[PDB]
Amino acid sequence: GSLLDEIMAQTRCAPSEEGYDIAKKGVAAFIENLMGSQHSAEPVNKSLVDQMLVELDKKISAQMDEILHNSQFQAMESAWRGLKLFVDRTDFRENNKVEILHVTKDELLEDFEFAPETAQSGLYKHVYSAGYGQFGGEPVGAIIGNYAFTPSTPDMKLLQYMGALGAMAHAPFISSVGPEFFGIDSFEELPNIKDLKSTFESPKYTKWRSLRESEDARYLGLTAPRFLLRVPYDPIENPVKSFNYAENVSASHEHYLWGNTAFAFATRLTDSFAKYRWCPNIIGPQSGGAVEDLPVHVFESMGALQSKIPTEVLITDRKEFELAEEGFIALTMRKGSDNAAFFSANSIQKPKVFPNTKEGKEAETNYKLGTQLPYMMIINRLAHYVKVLQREQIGAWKERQDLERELNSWIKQYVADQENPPADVRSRRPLRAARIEVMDVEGNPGWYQVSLSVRPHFKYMGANFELSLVGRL
């Protein structure tokens, strides 16, 4: 009973009151590892306890870099902590809600194979009928796709059945393409691509270039590379409770918790709605397309002290403009800080070349405004308000002249027909002019083919700045 004598000589917890069973486990554990190096001195033992903690943390953190960083864990951590980045940023007090649907990506194409028509699918029930197609129910603004799209047939058949779903419920489906979409199989070699226009004119993409020409592709945006979610832990910077955890991140950059940027692009759909109650404001580094507060990880490079880029590539301005013409919502990263920016939210639809007539040169610029997708979101709201507002009216005592007036006096609080209004009148009233022409339907009288023809304001994109010197002036 000499171990009881060491507790009773230890006057801090001697007479068996509290903590005498824990400290008894402390003495007996240190003696079992003491035989590797015999030494008898307490301050060296205060280092020898610490030398049994550094070797212990090599045993634990090498296991906790393997219980983490797993393909089942990390893909189900980025898909769920990335939701928390969509919940924490969006102000739910400013009239915002978000629905959460558990599907899997292989189940969803089977569910479109399930119904003979997209208007009887199971996803059509949750996008259209449980939301928008419902008396009093709140309608759906956009669909975040937490997916990684390939250019194969089981992913061009899905987007053909999501463009048709997006054209029925007036909500664009935002998701992302993968590394294998560009044909690189490892993502950080994207700026090495020296001609991305010729890559998309390959016969592997026949189900892509036919998707782009389609009419219902207007409601399909496919987003950025990827973005970082979790800073790897550190015993000084971001510690853990009663433990020192240094997450040894290897040269493989797949071990970082890389999220899906359909989360981060819908952050700008909602942080534009929480400020102006509309959403054309998604393409500005200082005007509402700036994904701020990204995680950074300052590590040691080959000699220097650099930072891990929070998006996996540094998208140049020419690479982003070439992605903008080819229908991609790219996220350039502010090199050297924790910010990023969108510059053009163009949907995958292609501007169809119309012949060189007077109307053809006009309608080409008219059809170009459909594809760009901040402008869909100022008329998707003019399909969600007007569906709700003319649902209450069924059964009233109205006229065609009364139908013209309940719409013209309604939308002219969204119209600021003015060449230079202030910066708040432009975004509270995103339209600029609106024409409403109510007609009739003969045969069955009292059915009204009205033609709401809105027109937006125009943002800032590209100039020339052709410098010279004059010498005198």
Binding site: L3, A23, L83, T104, H126, F273
Partner: protein
């Protein structure tokens, strides 16, 4: 994490808000988005037209995560011994956002419950170690008494 307050009344009830404070806003039908995608670790056997959509805001995110029962069961590499070709399956039960942290992941692994308990026994030693210099006097007695020491290590 609760401020001690009094019963409310017609008298006035001051409570030091150690907190600072935010603000809120409202609209028409809110801009509702539907986040769709794989959120658990399997494929559910019910067809799509019967399962439901859950509404998440900042206040109920801890309750949506708890009732999902994200149970991640996988076989990972064993780096707790000298074997390279050893594997060790785990069992995870996630109920809060702090369950992703290694304090609660290692607490759900029984092979790591004994290693944090090993460290907690070593942090407990370091306090009374260098304060009393009579501990090293009996380390040499345990160096002398080798028979009675090994009989007590098994206990």
């Amino acid at each position: 994490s609760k401020e001690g307050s009094v019963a409310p009344k017609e008298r006035i009830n001051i409570k030091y808000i150690p907190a600072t404070g935010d603000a809120q806003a409202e609209v028409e039908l809110p801009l509702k988005t539907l986040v769709v995608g794989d959120f658990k670790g399997h494929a559910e056997q019910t067809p799509l037209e019967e399962r439901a959509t859950v509404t998440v805001d900042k206040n109920n995110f801890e309750a949506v995560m708890r009732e999902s029962e994200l149970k991640i069961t996988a076989t990972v590499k064993n780096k707790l011994t000298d074997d390279e070709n050893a594997e060790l399956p785990v069992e995870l039960n996630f109920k809060s956002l702090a369950d992703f942290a290694p304090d609660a992941v290692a607490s759900q692994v029984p092979e790591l419950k004994k290693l944090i308990e090993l460290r907690e026994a070593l942090v407990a030693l370091k306090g009374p170690l260098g304060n009393i210099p009579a501990f090293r006097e009996r380390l040499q007695s345990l160096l002398n008494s080798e028979e009675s020491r090994e009989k007590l290590l098994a206990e």
